[PDB]
Design a protein around this ligand. Structure first.
Ligand code: MG
Lengths: 143, 140
């Protein structure tokens, strides 16, 4: 609320989706919040450390360079996986929905049968370069 | 396949060659660790993964530099490949181990694959060399 202050923000418009890339700050340090605004104003959030954001900028870079090769392999005629794990706990997954022309990104934490849920955005493939450019500009300026 | 550029980083008895190479598919980074009798271990990365690898090294360096949430292990599954990066400690020294395995098809599992082990003292030098070849020869 008044705990976290906002330092900077960028808006990117791709199809009917609006993304806000925010640089924010609290007691715990500086982080990057991505807000996606869908139909009916349904927001989904992705929240990144400044080091995971650097990584994420480059994962987007990888897909931009390699979008078809990293897409889902065609099925068998009648005759892909992109996952990052850190300290065996924190997961980030990126996967193309070919029907949507979307890149789905999920961040989760696993803790045996411990409980936890996580965070998911989907980026139209036609706004990948623009999203990534905006993300990169915020990293250049906000350490 | 053409050798565009190389750099050598010397860390204890080991030497690490970082080479940019070019072929059909695109540019890659060959890393090759040479021990005291010339035994080689080799790692080949696309430039995209080389860039990811640069970022992982910054994180290992933040952990190594800490006095007394910091990256201890990183795993990346990308296409038919897995990469395992483990900041290991023994009493003889701290080092970063990097294992590559590759999936050789359905039902075949994956190859044990070649391993490099980077003494922690040389992470910064190694990262600096990598970053310089990415700047001079990378795309992303
Ligand atoms: Mg993560």
């Amino acid at each position: 609320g008044p705990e976290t202050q906002e330092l900077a923000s960028k808006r990117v418009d791709i199809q009917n989706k609006r993304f806000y890339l925010d640089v924010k700050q609290n007691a715990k340090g500086r982080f990057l919040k991505i807000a996606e605004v869908g139909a009916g104003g349904n927001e989904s959030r992705l929240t990144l450390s400044m080091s995971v954001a650097v990584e994420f900028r480059d994962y987007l870079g990888d897909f931009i360079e390699h979008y078809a090769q990293l897409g889902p392999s065609q099925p068998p005629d009648l005759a892909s996986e992109f996952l990052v794990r850190e300290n065996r706990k924190y997961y980030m997954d990126l996967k193309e929905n070919q029907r949507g022309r979307f890149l789905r990104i999920r961040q989760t934490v696993n803790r045996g049968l411990g409980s936890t849920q996580g965070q998911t955005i989907a980026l139209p493939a036609q706004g990948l370069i623009e999203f990534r450019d905006a993300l990169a500009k915020l990293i250049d300026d906000y350490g």
